[PDB]
Amino acid sequence: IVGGYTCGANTVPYQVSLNSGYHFCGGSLINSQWVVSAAHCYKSGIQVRLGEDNINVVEGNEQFISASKSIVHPSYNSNTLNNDIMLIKLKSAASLNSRVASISLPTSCASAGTQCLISGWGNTKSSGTSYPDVLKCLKAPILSDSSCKSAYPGQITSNMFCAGYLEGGKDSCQGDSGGPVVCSGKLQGIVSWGSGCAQKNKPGVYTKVCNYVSWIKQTIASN
């Protein structure tokens, strides 16, 4: 996250870190046994880490659970990143408490202008590299589809939406992928992609979660 702020130990209890010997992507806990992330974050040997603040220090509230199965969206396209969403099942149910909670799925889509909270352990510099050990947060509004498509002509689909500031300075970045975008208490987006980080006229692109609620609910119920 570039231009954001330190969230504070477990102020985002649904935020998880995907670990394959090191943090590589973010994720969102939707219930005791399931996590939602980006399909482009897929890989074998995934260990889900919950209740994390400083990902390089054991503070006492973390829960490390191995993934039993991964399900990338059936129509995920790695070239265009269309349908960039995947489900990850926990080998054993997570212990839900205060630092470890799930985030509700949307009942309907959010509109442009709506403010959301984007979080992650990704790069914090837009013209360099510096990865944080503590969870970073950023409040950003959903941008009009017109400004989104204008910024990325011929690249935006109905399964994506832009959020951030066209003036640059605040945005998600490498390391934040798969992470949450929560608007009005609902998981409306997943950190997907963008051109650079916090660059003017280049907002972050997020997977439009509201389009996948049926698939998510049906897939989880059948697995």
Residue 36 partner contact from ligand RWJ, Ca ion, none using kind-dependent CB cut-offs of 5 to 8 Å = none
111 counts as catalytic: no
Q: Confirm whether residue 57 is marked as ligand binding.
A: yes
Q: Which CB sits closer to ligand RWJ, 24 or 215?
A: 24
Q: What's the min distance (Å) between Cβ of 189 and Ca ion? A: 25
Exactly one of 28, 37, 84, 119 is catalytic; name it. Answer: 84
Residue 136 partner contact from ligand RWJ, Ca ion, none using kind-dependent CB cut-offs of 5 to 8 Å = none
Q: Confirm whether residue 54 is marked as ligand binding.
A: yes
For ligand RWJ, the binding residues (CB under 6 A) are 24-25, 40-41, 81, 122, 171-177, 191, 193-194, 197, 204
| 150-159 contacts at long range (C-beta below 8 A, 24 or more positions apart) | 151/201, 151/202, 151/203, 152/195, 152/202, 152/205, 155/80, 155/205, 156/205, 157/80, 157/82, 158/208, 158/211, 159/82, 159/83, 159/84, 159/207, 159/208, 159/211
Strand partners, 143: none
DSSP structure class, residue 152: S
23 counts as catalytic: no
Structure tokens at 28: 């969102």
Q: Measure the CA–CA gap between 170 and 121, rounded to whole angstroms.
A: 14
Exactly one of 23, 28, 37, 40 is catalytic; name it. Answer: 40
Q: Confirm whether residue 175 is marked as ligand binding.
A: yes
In one-letter notation, the amino acid at residue 42 is: Y
Within 15-74, the residues that bind Ca ion by CB under 5 A are 52, 54, 59, 62
Q: What's the min distance (Å) between Cβ of 139 and ligand RWJ? A: 15
66 counts as catalytic: no
- Dihedral Cα 49, 50, 52, 55, nearest 10 deg: 0
Residues found near Ca ion in the complex (CB under 5 A): 52, 54, 59, 62
Catalytic residues: 40, 84, 177
Q: Which residues are annotated as a binding site for substrate?
A: 171-172, 174-175, 177
